[PDB]
Amino acid sequence: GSSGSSGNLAAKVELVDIQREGALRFMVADDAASGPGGTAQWQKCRLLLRRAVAGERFRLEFFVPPKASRPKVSIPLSAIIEVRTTMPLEMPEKDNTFVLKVENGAEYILETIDSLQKHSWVADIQGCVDSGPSSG
Numbered sequence: 001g002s003s004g005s006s007g008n009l010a011a012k013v014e015l016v017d018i019q020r021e022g023a024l025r026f027m028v029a030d031d032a033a034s035g036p037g038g039t040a041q042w043q044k045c046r047l048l049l050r051r052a053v054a055g056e057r058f059r060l061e062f063f064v065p066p067k068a069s070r071p072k073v074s075i076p077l078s079a080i081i082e083v084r085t086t087m088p089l090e091m092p093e094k095d096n097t098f099v100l101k102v103e104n105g106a107e108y109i110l111e112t113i114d115s116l117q118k119h120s121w122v123a124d125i126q127g128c129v130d131s132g133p134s135s136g
Contacts, residue, residue, distance in 0.1 A: 006136060019049040019058070019124040022117060023066050026073075029099075029107040042111065045072070049124045052076065055136070058128040060100075062108075079103045080129050083122055098122050 025042040032041060046066030052059040058077035063070075079102035087093040095115035100108040112118040 017051045021048045024112045026110045057132040077128050
């Protein structure tokens, strides 16, 4: 007698749940024609990468502002289907920027301190999205 079919996943890992956390700017590729336009769409937010519970492996949180008690654009790590590290023609191809393609056809352009932080992040996310098991 049992229910769930999850399995026995026990790891004595001696590491921290939070993979990576930092305060960087984020933006979504869209019309954004909500006015005249000008100021750098770049918005202040805090990126917090932590493992999720109740199934979900991980979940990305975009605290906007980064001082808010709760995340504004809290997206699950499951939504991410592909992370493009390329840049458009209107972008100077910053060394500290990356795109996040979710399952809802939405790209989130983020900008970290330097090419050092950026790359890292791409690893914290990709390392989770992929790591996740095939089923359940």
